[PDB]
Every structure is written in structure tokens, then in C-alpha cells.
Design a protein around this ligand. Structure first.
Ligand SMILES: O=c1ccn([C@@H]2O[C@H](COP(=O)(O)O)[C@@H](O)[C@H]2O)c(=O)[nH]1
Length: 234
């Protein structure tokens, strides 16, 4: 249903104040659907076609953010053509414009922030940026008692130069543990338990920075992000 005041739009598009945008409007210099609009409060709907001094001001759709609970057997990109993308779950216009701010492997489930906001996304995904992801990891063999520390100090991924930046591991059950990592390498958790001689059976992402997965968002389900959620991300 997204829409906005015509002035607020001319404002954003021109890099001027809404107060001045309003002015330019009464100056008979703003057009909608090929007609002169002198009202600053005009309700600008997507199907409209705005123009400034004859020049068409491309309607840059507002940005969207969504919380998804990724189910198994689906991927977060089209890089692979053997599995359907998680887009099969987003009933939204031009959904294809959305990208996962942090992809989840085909059989990993949990919080996946679908967004078409490049700036926002990058700040969450940059390899240089400290962002905390917290997973619920199910293990083949009871977590080794000395694993805990090993993760805090750090482990060396098989054939990797550096060490995994300190991670805190909590023990829910002998074989189920919650893991928090501020990094984001490729298949990092799986390989981490690899180094310490264990195997990841299941893997669920609960948190990304300041956004946590709702307790009642069934896998496959999603929902727009809350104003606070956007601003708080990390
Ligand atoms: O510590 C981590 C973080 C992520 N992943 C998994 O690795 C993936 C990233 O690779 P890709 O989804 O871009 O192919 C995440 O999707 C998730 O399933 C892990 O095994 N360990």
C-alpha cells in the first residue's frame, strides 16, 4: 500500500527540504501523470509518474525489510539451479529485488533477513564488521567438555591461515548447544566443530545482531521488520 506526500518525495529526490520541495510544487514545476500538481500533500501512489521541470523523476520504491524463518531444502540465492530459492515463501511484489542479508546454507534454518537495502545489508554482512550471530547447534556427539574454551581462544579451520575469532558456547543439552560468533566465514560453525572433532547434525540461527527470531514464526513464514528492528539491527 506504500505511498507518500508528493512534497516529501520531491524533497528526497531533489536533496532539498520538504519546506522547499513544497515551494517548487506550487511553482507549477512538478508533474504527475503528465499534469501539473500544485499540492504539497498530494498522495503519491506507485502507479504515478512524477516529473520535475519536464524531467522524469524515477520513482525509487521505498525500502523493505523482512524476517524469515528459513526451512530446510531451500537456498538464499539463485547461484544454484538445483534448489528453489526462499523466494518461494515471499508473497510480495517484485520480490526478486530482495536479497538475504547473510545467506543460510540449504539445510540450515532460522533467521534470514531478506532485504533490498544495499547499505543496510552490507553493514550487517561486511567481513570487516563485527556482527553477532547466535545459533542453536545439534551435534552428532556430546560436546567435548574442553570444546568450550577451544572456541573462546579460537580454532583453526582446516587449511585456513587465521583463527576463528573468540566464540562463546553454552550447553543446553549434551548434544545441543547455543553458539555465538562475531565472524562470518563460509560454513563457519560446521567447520568449527570439525576442527574439534565433532559433527553438526542440525543448525538453527536464532539471532543476528539486535534482531532475534520470533518464537512463533513457523518455518517458511516471514513478516516485515519493525521500525525499531530496522534502526536497531547493529
Ligand atoms: O558459523 C556459521 C555460519 C553459517 N553457516 C552456514 O554457512 C552458510 C553460508 O554459506 P552460503 O549460504 O553463502 O552458501 C550459512 O548459510 C549457514 O547455513 C555455518 O555452518 N556456520
Amino acid at each position: 500500500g506504500s505511498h507518500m506526500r508528493l512534497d516529501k518525495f520531491i524533497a528526497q529526490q531533489l536533496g532539498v527540504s520538504r519546506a522547499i520541495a513544497g515551494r517548487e510544487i506550487r511553482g507549477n514545476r512538478v508533474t504527475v501523470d503528465g499534469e501539473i500538481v500544485r499540492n504539497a500533500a498530494f498522495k503519491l501512489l506507485p502507479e504515478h509518474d512524477v516529473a520535475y521541470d519536464g524531467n522524469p523523476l524515477a520513482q525509487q520504491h521505498g525500502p523493505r525489510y523482512f524476517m524469515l524463518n528459513k526451512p530446510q531444502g531451500y537456498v538464499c540465492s539463485t547461484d544454484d539451479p538445483d534448489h528453489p530459492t526462499v523466494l518461494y515463501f515471499l508473497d510480495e511484489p517484485v520480490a526478486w529485488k530482495l536479497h538475504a542479508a547473510g545467506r543460510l546454507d540449504i539445510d540450515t534454518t532460522g533467521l534470514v533477513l531478506m532485504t533490498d537495502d544495499g547499505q543496510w545489508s552490507h553493514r550487517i554482512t561486511s567481513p570487516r564488521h563485527h556482527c553477532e550471530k547466535t545459533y542453536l547447534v545439534t551435534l552428532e556427539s556430546p560436546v567435548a567438555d574442553d570444546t568450550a574454551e577451544q572456541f573462546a581462544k579460537g580454532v583453526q579451520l582446516h587449511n585456513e591461515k587465521d583463527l576463528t575469532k573468540p566464540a562463546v558456547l553454552e550447553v543446553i543439552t549434551p548434544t545441543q548447544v547455543r553458539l555465538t560468533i562475531s565472524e562470518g566465514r563460509y560454513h563457519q560453525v560446521k567447520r568449527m566443530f570439525a576442527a574439534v572433532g565433532n559433527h553438526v547434525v542440525e543448525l538453527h540461527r536464532e539471532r543476528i545482531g539486535g534482531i532475534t527470531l520470533d518464537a512463533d514464526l513457523a518455518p517458511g513464514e516471514y513478516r516485515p521488520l519493525t521500525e525499531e528492528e530496522i534502526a536497531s539491527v547493529v
